Amino acid sequence: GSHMDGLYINNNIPKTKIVLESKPDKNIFYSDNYQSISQRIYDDNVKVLNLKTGKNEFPLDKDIKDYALYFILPENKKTENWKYLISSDSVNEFTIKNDSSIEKD
Amino acid sequence: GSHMDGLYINNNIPKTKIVLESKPDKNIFYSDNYQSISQRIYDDNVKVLNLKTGKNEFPLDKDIKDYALYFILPENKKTENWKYLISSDSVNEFTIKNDSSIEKD
Ligand SMILES: [Br-]
Ligand SMILES: [Br-]
Ligand SMILES: [Br-]
Ligand SMILES: [Br-]
Ligand SMILES: [Br-]
Ligand SMILES: [Br-]
Ligand SMILES: [Br-]
Ligand SMILES: [Br-]
Ligand SMILES: [Br-]
Ligand SMILES: [Br-]
Numbered sequence: 001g002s003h004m005d006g007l008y009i010n011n012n013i014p015k016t017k018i019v020l021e022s023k024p025d026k027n028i029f030y031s032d033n034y035q036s037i038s039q040r041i042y043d044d045n046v047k048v049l050n051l052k053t054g055k056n057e058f059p060l061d062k063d064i065k066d067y068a069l070y071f072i073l074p075e076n077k078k079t080e081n082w083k084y085l086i087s088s089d090s091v092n093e094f095t096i097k098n099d100s101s102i103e104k105d
Numbered sequence: 106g107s108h109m110d111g112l113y114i115n116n117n118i119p120k121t122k123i124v125l126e127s128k129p130d131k132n133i134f135y136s137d138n139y140q141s142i143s144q145r146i147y148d149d150n151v152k153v154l155n156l157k158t159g160k161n162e163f164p165l166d167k168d169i170k171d172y173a174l175y176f177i178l179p180e181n182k183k184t185e186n187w188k189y190l191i192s193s194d195s196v197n198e199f200t201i202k203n204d205s206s207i208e209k210d
Contacts, residue, residue: 017147034147038144038146038147039143042143042177044120044179048147048153072147074147074149
């Protein structure tokens with residue numbers, strides 16, 4: 001693809017959300033679950049975003065190198081590969097398939 | 106003012122957020138606190154939004170009559186008049202003053 005640095009997500013599953021956290025603490029990231037993240041939602045470096053089905057793009061800040069991206073599938077359901085550390089200096093492309101599995105491309 | 110139906114918020118306090126919930130249960134609204142709301146953030150009818158300082162507008166859905174609007178001041182601080190039931194069929198105008206008090210106009 002010809003996308004430039006950024007966050008791009010193709011989504012098949014209605015009602016999915018993402019949580020995006022700038023400057024994550026990596027130790028918290030590795031332990032995090034849906035509940036622990038929810039307790040940070042008021043923090044200035046955290047956003048909760050709806051995904052549309054289809055194509056989505058979300059803005060990253062080039063002055064922030066590192067982000068944590070958490071995929072929140074609906075109905076409190078889990079998939080294996082649901083959390084990622086990503087860079088504003090890379091092209092980050094994801095797909096959520098019909099079976100709720102998540103691929104980073 | 107000449108605004109049309111909608112949600113309009115003037116904000117003096119950096120890092121304030123709002124939670125907007127379509128079709129609220131009014132009994133939950135009256136008991137809610139910052140923590141109880143955080144536990145609903147993945148629900149399809151809930152959004153957490155950053156406020157900028159200055160003027161803000163957020164979209165309501167005319168097909169949804171009722172919303173709950175919660176103001177989340179930073180540093181886990183409380184102000185008295187922080188939660189509102191609002192209609193998509195009204196002009197809803199709010200100001201967050203420098204002293205963190207909130208006025209509906
Ligand atoms: Br959203
Ligand atoms: Br769509
Ligand atoms: Br798609
Ligand atoms: Br799993
Ligand atoms: Br997966
Ligand atoms: Br936001
Ligand atoms: Br501003
Ligand atoms: Br203002
Ligand atoms: Br109070
Ligand atoms: Br107040």
